[PDB]
Amino acid sequence: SPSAQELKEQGNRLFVGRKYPEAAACYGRAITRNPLVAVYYTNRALCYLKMQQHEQALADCRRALELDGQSVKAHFFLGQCQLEMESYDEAIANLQRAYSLAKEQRLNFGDDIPSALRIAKKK
């Protein structure tokens, strides 16, 4: 009886090892246990992007944003996805919104700018 969190974990570790189809299956199972969690869709969206399944990534991005319109990563992956699909004007709009939200949330709450948006995040 794995919990939805527990499943997101297993998927996150799977994703680390570039096991993307298996990681997407885990996030999918987390979504089925609790389908109103933006991050599960955001995480699976990235798996589909790595798998070059762009239509599925886009739909996951759209669902995440319906649950959480303030999501930095969902805007970013949505923009990255629309980049890969060559919807360039939409992609730029969502990328800027991702970076704008990241700044707002950094300055109101203290969040780190998500690492997905940075190429040189200190490790």
Ligand X SMILES: Cn1ncc2c(NCc3cccnc3)nc(-c3cccc(NC(=S)Nc4cccc(C(F)(F)F)c4)c3)nc21
Name the residues that contact its own copies, by CB under 8 A.
Answer: 46, 49-50, 52, 77, 80, 83-84, 88-89, 91-92, 95-96, 99-100, 103, 106-107, 113, 116-120, 122
The Cα–Cα gap between 80 and 3 comes to 30
Smallest distance from ligand X to CB 54, Å: 17
| Residue 55 burial (C-beta neighbours within 10 Å; 0-12, 13-18, 19+) | exposed
Q: How far is CA 66 from CA 75, 90, 110, in A?
A: 11, 17, 24
12 binds ligand X (CB under 6 A): yes
Give me the residues that bind ligand X (CB under 6 A), please. Answer: 12, 15-16, 42-43, 46, 73, 112, 114-116, 121, 123
